[PDB]
Amino acid sequence: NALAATNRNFKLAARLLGLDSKLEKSLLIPFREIKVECTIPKDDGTLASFVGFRVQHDNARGPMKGGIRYHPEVDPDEVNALAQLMTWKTAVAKIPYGGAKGGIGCDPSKLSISELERLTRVFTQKIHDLIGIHTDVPAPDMGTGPQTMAWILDEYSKFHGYSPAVVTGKPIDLGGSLGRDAATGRGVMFGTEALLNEHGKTISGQRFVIQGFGNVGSWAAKLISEKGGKIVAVSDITGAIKNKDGIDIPALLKHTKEHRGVKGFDGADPIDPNSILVEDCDILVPAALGGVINRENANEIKAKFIIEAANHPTDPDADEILSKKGVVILPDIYANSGGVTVSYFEWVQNIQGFMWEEEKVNDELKTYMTRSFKDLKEMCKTHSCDLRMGAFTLGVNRVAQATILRGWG
Amino acid sequence: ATNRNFKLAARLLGLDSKLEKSLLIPFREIKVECTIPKDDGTLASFVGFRVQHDNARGPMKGGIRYHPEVDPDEVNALAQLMTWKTAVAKIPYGGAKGGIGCDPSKLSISELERLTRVFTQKIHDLIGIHTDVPAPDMGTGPQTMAWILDEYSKFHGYSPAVVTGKPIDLGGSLGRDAATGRGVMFGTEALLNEHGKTISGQRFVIQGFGNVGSWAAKLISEKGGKIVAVSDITGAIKNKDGIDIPALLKHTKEHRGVKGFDGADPIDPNSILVEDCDILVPAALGGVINRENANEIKAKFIIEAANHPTDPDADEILSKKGVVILPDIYANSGGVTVSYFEWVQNIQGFMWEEEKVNDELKTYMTRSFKDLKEMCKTHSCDLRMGAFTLGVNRVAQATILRGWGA
Amino acid sequence: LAATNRNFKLAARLLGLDSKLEKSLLIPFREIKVECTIPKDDGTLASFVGFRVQHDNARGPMKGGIRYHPEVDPDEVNALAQLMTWKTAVAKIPYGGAKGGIGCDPSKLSISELERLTRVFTQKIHDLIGIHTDVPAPDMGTGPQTMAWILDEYSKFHGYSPAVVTGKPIDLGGSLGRDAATGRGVMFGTEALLNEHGKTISGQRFVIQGFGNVGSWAAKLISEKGGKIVAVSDITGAIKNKDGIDIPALLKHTKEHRGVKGFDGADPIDPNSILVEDCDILVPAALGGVINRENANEIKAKFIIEAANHPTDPDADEILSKKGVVILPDIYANSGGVTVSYFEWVQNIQGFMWEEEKVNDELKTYMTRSFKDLKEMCKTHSCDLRMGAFTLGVNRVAQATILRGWG
Amino acid sequence: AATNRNFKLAARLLGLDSKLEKSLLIPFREIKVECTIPKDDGTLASFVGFRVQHDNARGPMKGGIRYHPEVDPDEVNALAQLMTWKTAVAKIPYGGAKGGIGCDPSKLSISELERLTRVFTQKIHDLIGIHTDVPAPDMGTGPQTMAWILDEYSKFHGYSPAVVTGKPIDLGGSLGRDAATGRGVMFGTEALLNEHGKTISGQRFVIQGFGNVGSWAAKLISEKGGKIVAVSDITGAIKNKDGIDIPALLKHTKEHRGVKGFDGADPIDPNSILVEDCDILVPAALGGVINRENANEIKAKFIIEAANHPTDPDADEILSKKGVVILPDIYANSGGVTVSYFEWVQNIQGFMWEEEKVNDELKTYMTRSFKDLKEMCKTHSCDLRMGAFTLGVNRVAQATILRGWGA
Ligand SMILES: NC(=O)c1ccc[n+]([C@@H]2O[C@H](COP(=O)([O-])OP(=O)(O)OC[C@H]3O[C@@H](n4cnc5c(N)ncnc54)[C@H](O)[C@@H]3O)[C@@H](O)[C@H]2O)c1
Ligand SMILES: NC(=O)c1ccc[n+]([C@@H]2O[C@H](COP(=O)([O-])OP(=O)(O)OC[C@H]3O[C@@H](n4cnc5c(N)ncnc54)[C@H](O)[C@@H]3O)[C@@H](O)[C@H]2O)c1
Ligand SMILES: NC(=O)c1ccc[n+]([C@@H]2O[C@H](COP(=O)([O-])OP(=O)(O)OC[C@H]3O[C@@H](n4cnc5c(N)ncnc54)[C@H](O)[C@@H]3O)[C@@H](O)[C@H]2O)c1
Ligand SMILES: NC(=O)c1ccc[n+]([C@@H]2O[C@H](COP(=O)([O-])OP(=O)(O)OC[C@H]3O[C@@H](n4cnc5c(N)ncnc54)[C@H](O)[C@@H]3O)[C@@H](O)[C@H]2O)c1
Ligand SMILES: [K+]
Ligand SMILES: [K+]
Ligand SMILES: [K+]
Ligand SMILES: [K+]
């Protein structure tokens, strides 16, 4: 229902643009799909064989960009859909990349740290000729992180010389960008302010509910409350809390670092975790899992705005229900694009051999997301469509035009 | 399954199960978009692909198929089979298989050239004289290879060894037309010698009269073999005293087929495999020897010129009747061996005379039959299992030597 | 062109250049001709000769346009490549000079044949050009779409390389401000030259011949600074208004018609008399050779800004110098274009595009400095602006060449 | 001298498409590079190096490097094209090229010549290569020049002996290269004679020229029983109707300036050498020595063109009607280029051959070329010269067509 939603949205956008069927078919087929054998000796000496893979969906607008997932549940349709989605997302963000997605079918929880390094290095050896600073730039995803990127960078640099721009999400000490940690949450705050301004409103005074308090949710809550938003309820995997007068986010952040989660926070009451999405508020921010808003709770949402920080939190049934209630939904492909935008800035800084101060990273991020929202808004006016459809048509249109300009022979 | 021969071979060997799993997984699988402008200006998009199964023993080798019916399991099985066949042949290659999902009968010659060049552009960094050397297959031919060579050479400089099956004027090897049929004759003499016999005087039945069948008939009859019956798609003919192959060849060039040949009587095409003879050579399609006719085969030797003419049921039946079956993976390997010789000549920058091509082919197929026979003694198995056991073992030992990085 | 070698040899005289170094500077680094054969749309073969003269790379990668035009003259191509070497040095951008093209008639080729020809040409020269080797650009017969095709084909051989050509569409990495660049530079150089005479653009009365990319942008930006545009001409006719032509109003007219002809707010005039119109500043921005042995005595302008290439011939150079007319030479006056193409390459190399405000501020900085350096050479060698420009460029190339050495 | 007419006649005999013929005439690539060196006196000297790469449909290009002040572009292009046809006639997997430097080696010290050779190599190394373009000696260059090229090129690409031919034996030159052209002259003569039911043994030969080609041809022909009845060189002409003792003559010629004064032969008028009574005439010195004034009196039944262009078109017609069979130079002296192919092969294969193998392969190659040449003459009802050109043009055309023209 995320792979179905990507191809449904692409085809709806292609019809709004009047795309020729033969160009549409070209845009659907990935540039390249690669599967490689990754066999390593385990710590006990015996062999273990894994399949690594990389779908490189499109490079009309620049090098491909996308995460590397270490996860046993590999589905070819889902991986292809995610690589295709990144092609549209980078175009919406107006960063000079196409989309890719890769990974290894493995369970990292069953591998030692030494086996994970051996597997990462073998995988890099098997694909180093297929990726590259101006070809395809990987990033972390489920099951991988900054240490994984460090190993990819180190192994790749044996083959091509020191090449920090070959991956993003690196530790700061190896060329990671300042502002990366806050990037997605900060972009959520920027896009919310852009949307509210369009309705003559401002973050200050608005009441927020945030489901999820991880990298995205905690930064969004911190930065939104610093602009005067009142965060009246938050949840994570350990429980849900509420304070109608507003949760003290600095105190909550201090609580959550010392405990497993928001549960037990002194400055808020615990509440039914299944009630968080239907709490009275102005703005609802799903920032944990997808599929949480469906035909069953959609009629009970009280927010006027939904900011999709998580990927695919709303299904198509709830979209129609919420549209008819007058709820405005800022779509995920734009709302959480602060992360991929600052990953572009990381690559830029590495390419330029010179890192930026955090203020510059955040000022460029604001510039980029203001421009994307304006272009998204103009697409909606041009095609008389909602925000989700404006973002897909914007992204598809940019890729189609770059493809047409470059030609076919 | 199509893995049955491999899995049986891994058990005759003592193959560690984790190494066995590794040998099954292909080194690399690639799918690329191939989009071209058609003659009418509109776009056409195709998917090109290449399964690179194994390169422990050297560059990968395998055909390029232009055909609308792509089956991933079959492409993978054929690439894996090539890995074992090159090892049986003792040529320094692994296996690969590739193609484009397209229908060439619906594409103009200029569109086919454009598609071939775009496909080459999309894979040029994945193939190479010491990496992966393609060849013709269904839907492709020497002209296709010429276009691949020409486009590849724009990216890497002039590289004639990057494909085999090229036209002679572009570095193709002499003796390629006859190679598979000649190897069928070489392999038959090697098997017969082991039984204290020779081709001269033996009665052959040959099903199929194409590139393999006609060359085998011509060369076997020139060694004194009596070709008593032949068939093709147009009909079957018989002459108990021996068919005049030179006359039949002249007839087939002028009449589209063996049908109507003067000097042979016509027979039921469905009875050719059970004709009385010494040596049966299926050289047309696979699956023609099965559990329904196997008990009625009269030959003492079956030479598998075609790919998989005998199914496992017939193997069992024919073994207990005392019939010796020269397996396809060895018997028709003259083709892949001479394609190695083509690559060698290109690498050496100097072409061989046909006499040298044929002498080296005889040496290679004699030595490979010798090693296959020794494998059969070691493991007390038939020829087919000796061949798979030989090929898997060679790949396994090269893989173990190269290691995994510790 | 013996006129381009005349300015070079004079500059080599003024500097103390060793005669063997002078000979070296004349000889191009490389000259390449390649066969470009394509199937035509009707199936038959067509063969063209593509070429690239790479004149000098002492100061950095070579830079120069690609011309699709049937009338190829080897002398002219060499002269333009050499002139680009001095011009990049005058602008102080880290490039040398090159010039290339294909002898073909684009008006006789379909858009499909033109794409095929461009890709084949690229395949035939891809190993001879490159991001840090030689960076082509549009010229007569080519444009942004041509550069897109070169970029796309080149990238098959070397990976995505947006900095390999300049003049790209904005969507493929072209720079903001490229359209206005040459005209903006013409205006920048005019203000610098006037300030040296204690004057400002504001109030000066301009005649501009040509209303194309250079002329219309020059006319627009000069008028916004208070310049009085008293006469303008193009291929369709000439107009005059002693109080100044309303350029925003003229721009609306000229985009909806074939030209300035019929413009309300200006009276029509004889097209062949615009160059001798009473004014302070004359801006030839159309073709070359329009200032010659006979009209030199009747131009009323005290300043001539060479927006077009070589609008003044040596005979008029002699006449106007003795008449006290100041000529801002083409090699500096129109260098805004090549300077912003350098900025486009910089932005692609840096992986990050600039705002237009930054492009135009950098353009002002570069053209201010080159005018300052050019004026200093005129003092050192007691020469006119044209020789100050050539001595500045030749000297920069000579010093880089000497430092890099031989062996 | 450079009659390009043979090609056009061959293209019509083959019925070549007119657009394909035009493509075959246009060179793949023409390159001019600056070669500037410090001279021994410290000052700079600038030279122009060049390479015409005519065709590579059949494989890497092959051709000499000329150090000579008289560079003519039309001549260089014609020679590169001729090499394309000659390699095709010989059936060696090469196309044609020709290059050089405009310089006078007699005015350069050996240190300057080395510096110039290394600078030239640095300026073209990316344009040539073991599988791209393989240079060789020519006028003004020799084995030592090739050694310097090999050495400089190998700094950029690792040890690459196959990048040039004509190397000293110690750096990968082939055994049998010295005798190659003369031996090929002897092979082609025997092949031609067999077609007429004759053999070398007993035939009477007259040989003009006693250098690398003439002396080896004479030595090998007499060892096959040919009677060498008259020989000439730059010093004079000598005659012996019973046959000259070539081993004795060779020993005489190293101790003197020439065949003049040889004790085993009487001197003859040097202007009568071509009209001497014999069976086989072998011009092996200069071109143009057979023309309309001596043609009617040639006594030979066969003419073996060892030198380049010894018979002009006028004599071809005269001698054809007298029934004289002329073995054309493009084939007759191809032993040299064939053994240079064998040198490349040996270097590529990392393992040098014995002289016996070189000479056996040369016999195989030249026997086959003569058979293909003779068959072309039957197909197209033409003489030996046109059979050779149509054979070579046809091979290049067929390779070009097979490789195709898509992008
Ligand atoms: N981090 C980024 O830059 C980024 C960018 C794009 C999209 N996203 C999307 O954002 C979402 C969250 O990302 P993250 O990086 O913050 O993840 P994270 O792992 O840092 O945090 C996820 C949070 O959700 C909470 N959570 C998990 N399951 C829950 C449940 N059932 N109910 C309530 N809370 C639950 C966790 O406890 C945690 O607080 C995912 O859908 C992800 O795809 C993240
Ligand atoms: N040719 C090679 O180099 C090579 C290599 C490996 C394996 N093989 C195998 O050899 C077999 C034959 O290949 P080929 O190149 O000789 O083919 P081909 O197309 O040149 O000739 C095939 C012959 O089989 C006959 N035939 C076709 N269908 C028939 C039918 N239903 N009944 C009877 N006769 C029939 C045809 O009339 C023809 O005489 C194939 O199975 C192929 O996989 C060939
Ligand atoms: N455009 C640049 O960036 C640039 C840079 C360097 C040099 N130049 C030189 O500047 C000149 C003009 O370039 P452009 O880009 O403005 O050209 P353009 O194609 O934009 O048009 C120039 C204008 O001149 C007019 N014109 C043409 N012929 C005329 C004539 N005989 N009389 C009067 N008007 C005439 C045209 O109608 C048009 O209005 C050319 O010589 C060019 O090489 C331009
Ligand atoms: N050597 C080769 O490999 C080779 C290959 C192709 C073509 N050729 C052609 O062969 C011819 C000779 O080649 P070579 O290597 O033997 O040259 P060389 O310099 O070794 O010998 C030339 C000989 O001709 C004699 N000679 C010069 N001028 C003469 C004249 N006017 N009358 C009579 N004799 C005269 C000289 O004294 C000398 O004996 C030239 O046309 C050359 O282009 C040579
Ligand atoms: K695509
Ligand atoms: K494997
Ligand atoms: K120079
Ligand atoms: K050509």
Author numbering:
A (entry chain A): 2 to 410
B (entry chain B): 6 to 411
C (entry chain C): 4 to 410
D (entry chain D): 5 to 411
Q: What do the authors of the reporting publication say about this deposited model?
A:
In the AtGDH1-NAD+ complex, five subunits are in the open conformation (χ 70.2°–73.9°). Notably, 2OG had not been added to the protein preparation at any stage of purification or crystallization and, therefore, must have been captured from Escherichia coli cells during the recombinant protein expression. In the closed subunit, the NAD cofactor is significantly more buried and, therefore, less exposed to the outer environment. The envelopment of NAD is primarily the result of the closing movement of domain II toward domain I, as the interactions of the coenzyme with domain II in the closed form are very similar to those in the open form. In our closed-conformation subunit (with 2OG in the active site), NAD+ is clearly oriented in a way that is compatible with hydride transfer to the Si face of nicotinamide.
GDHs release the ammonium cation from glutamate in a reversible, NAD(P)+-dependent oxidative deamination reaction that yields 2OG.
